[PDB]
Amino acid sequence: MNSRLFRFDVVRTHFGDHGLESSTIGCPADTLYSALCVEALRMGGQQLLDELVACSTLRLTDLLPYVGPDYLVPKPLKSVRSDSSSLQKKLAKKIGFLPAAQLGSFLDGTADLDDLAARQTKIGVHAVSAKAAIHNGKKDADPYRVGYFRFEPDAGLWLLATGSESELGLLTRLLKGISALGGERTSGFGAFIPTESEVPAALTPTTAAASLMTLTTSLPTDDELEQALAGATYRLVKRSGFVASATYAETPRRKRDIYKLAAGSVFSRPFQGGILDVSLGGNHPVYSYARPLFLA
RNA sequence: ACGGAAACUUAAAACCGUGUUGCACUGCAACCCGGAAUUCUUGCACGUCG
Numbered sequence: 001m002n003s004r005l006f007r008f009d010v011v012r013t014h015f016g017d018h019g020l021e022s023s024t025i026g027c028p029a030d031t032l033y034s035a036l037c038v039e040a041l042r043m044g045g046q047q048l049l050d051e052l053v054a055c056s057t058l059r060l061t062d063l064l065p066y067v068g069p070d071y072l073v074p075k076p077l078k079s080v081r082s083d084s085s086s087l088q089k090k091l092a093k094k095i096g097f098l099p100a101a102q103l104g105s106f107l108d109g110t111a112d113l114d115d116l117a118a119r120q121t122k123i124g125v126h127a128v129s130a131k132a133a134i135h136n137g138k139k140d141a142d143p144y145r146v147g148y149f150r151f152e153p154d155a156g157l158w159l160l161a162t163g164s165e166s167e168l169g170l171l172t173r174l175l176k177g178i179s180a181l182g183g184e185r186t187s188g189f190g191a192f193i194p195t196e197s198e199v200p201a202a203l204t205p206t207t208a209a210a211s212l213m214t215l216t217t218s219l220p221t222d223d224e225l226e227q228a229l230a231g232a233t234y235r236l237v238k239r240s241g242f243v244a245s246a247t248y249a250e251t252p253r254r255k256r257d258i259y260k261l262a263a264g265s266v267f268s269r270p271f272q273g274g275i276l277d278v279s280l281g282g283n284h285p286v287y288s289y290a291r292p293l294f295l296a
Numbered sequence: 297a298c299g300g301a302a303a304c305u306u307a308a309a310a311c312c313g314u315g316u317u318g319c320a321c322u323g324c325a326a327c328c329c330g331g332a333a334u335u336c337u338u339g340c341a342c343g344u345c346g
Contacts, residue, residue: 015298015299016298016299016300017299018299019299020299020300027298030298031298031299031300032298033297033298034297034298034300035297035298036297037297038297038298038300039298040297041297049297053297130305131303131304131305132303132304132305132306133303133304133305134302134303134304135303135304135306136303140306140307141303141304141305141306141307142303142305143305143306144303181298182298183298183299183300183301184300184301185298185300186301186302190298238299240299241297241298241299241300242298242299242300242301243297243300244297244300244301245297245300245301246297247297248297252300252301254299255297255299255300278297279297284297285297286297287297
């Protein structure tokens with residue numbers, strides 16, 4: 001199989017975390033794959049979605065930053081051997097990403113920290129944008145304060161995706177026509193242009209090659225969680241949300257509250273990923289992605 | 297089936313009100329309308345008497 005390197009031009013975007021006034025640089029793929037099962041009904045016929053409801057034969061990364069020509073792959077959660085001073089102990093957690101090479105030098109306390117943190121403010125700015133609210137009835141309009149992320153003028157988000165090339169060819173069938181991503185996208189946000197380039201082969205999936213660093217907020221099955229946890233350096237998030245879509249036209253309710261693992265986490269053993277489903281009450285299934293992809 | 301899907305940073309309010317380009321100032325001081333030209337040169341109160 002090949003893989004696909006996806007270069008964007010994401011100027012402003014808004015992937016919230018717990019509301020709207022904040023943002024995140026990363027899109028954990030249960031947010032991205034859920035778009036691919038709602039921005040496929042707007043092009044297919046609910047047959048393209050039904051072609052890919054619960055197969056998970058396609059492994060795709062998340063939407064991680066890139067500053068110029070180098071992928072800003074995430075800061076892994078491995079125990080650093082910081083035999084140096086305690087300032088650069090604290091300076092690691094103020095660093096979310098790093099380029100594609102320095103990770104092995106990073107993990108043993110043998111790396112720079114005041115250049116990687118100096119390219120944090122080369123990614124882009126955590127902006128805000130005030131707006132004014134509803135004429136609720138006839139009363140006085142409120143504001144609503146909504147905050148975003150803004151990239152630098154030479155950045156965007158990257159993506160690596162592999163699997164069956166027919167169901168990979170239907171990703172790029174969809175993405176050449178997927179509109180403004182992000183959350184608050186009916187305004188000017190999350191708009192971008194997807195371009196194809198040939199991948200870096202320094203980032204192969206090392207599923208068992210003694211580099212068990214993932215590139216996707218993922219999850220194994222519930223039983224096999226007991227196997228891939230003895231040396232897992234992992235963090236837990238929430239991947240909740242709301243549901244209120246056509247063919248589900250009622251009052252808006254939520255997805256089921258899941259907690260996937262981290263996205264650059266390093267483990268003890270290989271594992272498998274599968275499409276968890278988050279529908280709680282109602283008609284059509286809604287489902288989280290959780291199908292990881294690995295790194296040297 | 298993206299912590300999504302909807303929303304105006306909006307409605308009114310005069311950079312206005314009091315204020316002279318004004319007050320003192322000769323178009324004034326000095327000079328002749330002044331100097332040389334004959335009202336003149338020709339010229340009879342008379343011719344005329346049985």
